[PDB]
Amino acid sequence: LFRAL
Amino acid sequence: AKCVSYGVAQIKAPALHSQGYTGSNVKVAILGTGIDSSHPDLNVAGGASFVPSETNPFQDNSSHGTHIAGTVLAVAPSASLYAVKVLGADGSGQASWVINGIEWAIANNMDVINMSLGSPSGSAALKAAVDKAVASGVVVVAAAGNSGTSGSSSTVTYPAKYPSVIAVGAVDSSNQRAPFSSVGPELDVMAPGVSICSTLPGGKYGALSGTSMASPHVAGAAALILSKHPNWTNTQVRSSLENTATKLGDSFYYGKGLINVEAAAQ
Ligand code: NA
Ligand code: NA
Secondary structure, three states, X not given: OEXXX | OOOOOHHHHHOOHHHHHHHOOOOOOOEXXXXXXXXXXXXXXXXEXXXXXXXXXXXXXXXXXXXXXXXXXXHHHHHOOOOEEEEEEOOOOOOEEOHHHHHHHHHHHHHOOOOEEEEOEEEOOOOHHHHHHHHHHHHOOOEEEEEOOOOOOEOOEOOOOEOOOOOOOEEEEEEOOOOOEOOOOOOOOOOOXXXXXXXXXXXXXXXXXXEEOOHHHHHHHHHHHHHHHHHHOOOOOHHHHHHHXXXXXXXXXXXXXXXXXXXXXHHHOO
């Protein structure tokens, strides 16, 4: 998944 | 911006503001959790959601998109914000959603894309999307990652890890690398990313930390640059930012160093 950094 | 943050001054944005440049007529796409368009200090010009469980891009049930949007405006008060929802409230999203948001941004003639998001893996399709955006003239900026260090290994996340994307790491108010900020030869520049005060959903304000916070400083800086030099290509904007950065140390940790928008926009 992509995730907010 | 109604919440005072040191980061705006650290990157030398007030110098552009004093020259009369505030990022007017620059379309910035904020790819993330949405933007709370009801916030009194944020105007959102358009947008789209690609998160099937969260269909409204003009709300933000995470807080991060709203915060990021605010930082872009703190740096470039006249920029036009677009809310492109590719992550849900828990900060997570599917690869394909991100790609959809990038495609949307290209099709809608965005000038700048900000991606405060990352994964340890990307995809050939994601690479193609960002490379297409760059070929189309878009300035493409991403947070470098919050994966700290891993010895000699790069810890830069995708999409920041792709060469066509500007990879932005985080420093604190003293220009020290934040302990969480990802590292590697793919880092390009640094910007403020520790305890940055900005807008939160529901008309609120507060400090957050992350490479997510550093990326919008650079996206906003790109808007300032484009306001002073609307004919510069994305290549020229990127070169301006990297070539005039304030060197901070070893490029594995700091890239070219801290952005200096005053110098970049000369
Ligand atoms: Na508003
Ligand atoms: Na990159």
